[PDB]
Amino acid sequence: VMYYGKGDVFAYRTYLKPLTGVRTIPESPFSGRDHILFGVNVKISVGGTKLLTSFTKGDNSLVVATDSMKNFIQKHLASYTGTTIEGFLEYVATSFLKKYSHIEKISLIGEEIPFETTFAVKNGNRAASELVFKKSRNEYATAYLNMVRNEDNTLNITEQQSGLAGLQLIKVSGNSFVGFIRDEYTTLPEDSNRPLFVYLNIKWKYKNTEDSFGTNPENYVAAEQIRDIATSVFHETETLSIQHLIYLIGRRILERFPQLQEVYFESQNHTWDKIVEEIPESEGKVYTEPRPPYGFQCFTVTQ
Template sequence: MFTMDDLNQMDTQTLTDTLGSIFEHSSWIAERSAALRPFSSLSDLHRKMTGIVKAADRETQLDLIKKHPRLGTKKTMSDDSVREQQNAGLSKLEQQEYEEFLMLNEHYYDRFGFPFILAVKGKTKQDIHQALLARLESERETEFQQALIEIYRIARFRLADIITEKGETQMKRTMSYGKGNVFAYRTFLKPLTGVKQIPESSFAGRSNTVVGVDVTCEIGGEAFLPSFTDGDNTLVVATDSMKNFIQRHLASYEGTTTEGFLHYVAHRFLDTYSHMDKITLTGEDIPFEAMPAYEEKELSTSRLVFRRSRNERSRSVLKAERSGNTITITEQYSEIMDLQLVKVSGNSFVGFIRDEYTTLPEDGNRPLFVYLNISWQYENTNDAYAFDPSRYVAAEQVRDLASTVFHELETPSIQNLIYHIGCRILARFPQLTDVSFQSQNHTWDTVVEEIPGSKGKVYTEPRPPYGFQHFTVTSEDAEKEKQKAAEKCRSLKA
């Protein structure tokens, strides 16, 4: 591996020898780039080398295109091309597959007058075959420009294989782009079964007969800098392509949960587009509930008709980064959002500071209406993907646990309520490290205090502003509550 300092200090011949294979059998590009030093980064070097090609006349560009081997061929080619085609599986084609590629490549060359070129890193032989079929339908000028774009991509991949930017001073900047509200629906996904049963919830799994997800995809990497600074879209993956990528991969996903789907898509993205450095995927479930059906003189649950639920929403977030050839999950959490719970009695709020600013009366028995966002993280992120369903924590179970604790607890404050909900969740699911809360107090304002002959009252919506709380409950908190409960039990027995 070489650094930018190494390249900037080389004589012209050494630089030409080092970078001569970046463009197939075209070391003249590396030789000319020597005059454009210093190179400030890998992206700067790539931009300057591709600029040399873009400035060349059309005959020279065509000659460069023709120097590339035909994909799937068994003829002699450069070491880089051999390695790239091997990684895509093109060196191990069955005889029938080889003959198919040979025929299509010949057809392509006869039609356009130059070989089919595709940056194959991260692609399978099926991907390549599909791209070849699709591009046979293009016009010649479109394919000429596309061939150059693919050559630029290949050059970027090859540069990344031999150059390290470690130790360089990089400008820290915000740089990412992506696609939001990517809606995808799938019928007959593999059912989620085998989840751990808990006393507080009847949840036993999901049929996954109809599954919906709203995905936001955000990608980043130094390779995208030229698209911002120079309007150079050579390495840009269109956000429309991101949408199609996500939707089509829902068809090939063989898991059972949104968390697992995000994990699958993140790896497929970074495997397919190796110039991406990082990706953040957010998936919000679009829940559907089975409707009643009257069959054979009996009311049952339909296996075909569902209604879209519009209550609380569950969401998953996953962040992944590339380091060399390794993809690392840097953050993963699941959450349930906008869970709205009201308990009509058994709630108090007393004993708070009273001074010249206080107008709120103390209340020993009030209705309490709370909005909750609850998120949870696993000690081992693999548990989130339901590879082992018994270690997966479902949003439905978190919802039911929150409701149960609210029912059981004589609530002195929202702060204490969310603390005990978190401890209960961690007690039931010790594979989690922590549970975090964002809560809001939406307790109603009283309109009629007393109704003759009834213990009821009349309320209206509260006026803003709303009180809120943020709190994280840890596994250490849950352990302390467990010890306190054990001590109380021993005390009662004594």
């Protein structure tokens, strides 16, 4: 391994070009983003054989300073004329390789810094404010891009992936976990009706990298739509395990978005411990936080 870069490059852009005309799906109202506020956290990694002596000899002649990579990213957010993080990453990568011929490979991660609308009273009625936004610490879109310079000096995207991170969903009933191995190590009771609490990170790849950019919004798959599919499928399914749930979410995603090649899931189980089983005159129960250990699952569904 030999690479170096800059992490936690925050950049907030006001009035990016709006994303509009995204083909809708029945699980989600999403059709686009106004982009009054567009926040992203970028990580940049660059490699190349010509970086060797920066390590072996302490020679900085071909070191682009990591601080300069941060300026590069923030200046390029100001000049980006597109409408998605995925497209922003391509713009940065192509511009960076064009600028710095001694770099053979660039890898970029962009994470949305999300904001939500708020209520303001305008002319006697509540409406979404065009000025005041709430910083959200819940789920967020992500994007990843790797680009290389070939021997013939052409540039090529070697990997692209979009995602949704930080989704935390609890379904209060309609979930079982039964029928698992019972042996000397098993103490977990079977549960016919648990309040399944799952953390979800979902990532997708497109058949055609072009479609990730949003230049034609009809082919763009938004993280918002993925979120809404996940909640709808969770609601619809009498789940039999997290494994069973995530497979079904992936199938739905790939049915709705035929331009996608695959969907990958990283899920964790955070289901609460039950404290009170029966409350007189109620269907209610009481639960509490479990001990730290958490189950997890990782799975790819392909088209």
